[PDB]
Amino acid sequence: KEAMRMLMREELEKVLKTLSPREAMVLRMRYGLLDGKPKTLEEVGQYFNVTRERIRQIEVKALRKLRHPSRSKYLKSLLSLMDENEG
């Protein structure tokens, strides 16, 4: 009962497997997993030593690497995560 939730952990797991520790970390921050508060790439990139282009690069290569283990979880997960959905 206590400490029970398991809301969901599919897309997060399917994507992380392709991204390296450093690449995933940037998205971890962007996702708000590091502290629980989602931040924009500007906060993450600037936090390290790179601009949006770095995660921009990861998203690209991630897509290339995803074309094998997962059909396109990154796309759907990213689409569902942002305001790409119509209201």
Side-chain angles (χ1 to χ4, degrees):
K1 185 177 68 147
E2 298 183 349
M4 189 187 298
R5 295 183 189 192
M6 196 81 199
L7 303 183
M8 43 187 184
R9 295 186 188 287
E10 308 185 348
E11 293 179 349
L12 301 184
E13 295 183 351
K14 299 295 186 61
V15 64
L16 178 72
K17 290 188 291 224
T18 170
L19 280 318
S20 326
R22 298 184 190 73
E23 292 178 342
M25 190 77 114
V26 89
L27 305 186
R28 283 183 187 180
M29 282 196 65
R30 187 172 180 199
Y31 285 36
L33 307 178
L34 184 72
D35 188 13
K37 60 216 279 266
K39 300 206 187 97
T40 68
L41 306 124
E42 185 184 1
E43 293 300 343
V44 188
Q46 294 177 341
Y47 256 46
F48 287 111
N49 65 343
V50 297
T51 71
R52 209 136 68 183
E53 185 185 2
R54 197 262 232 287
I55 314 98
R56 212 124 139 196
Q57 283 173 342
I58 300 181
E59 183 184 1
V60 185
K61 189 74 177 177
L63 293 148
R64 189 75 182 72
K65 297 184 186 215
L66 188 144
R67 292 182 65 273
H68 262 134
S70 302
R71 295 185 187 187
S72 51
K73 297 304 184 280
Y74 192 109
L75 189 162
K76 50 176 79 198
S77 188
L78 184 74
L79 185 76
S80 68
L81 185 72
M82 291 187 73
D83 294 345
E84 297 300 343
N85 295 345
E86 297 299 343

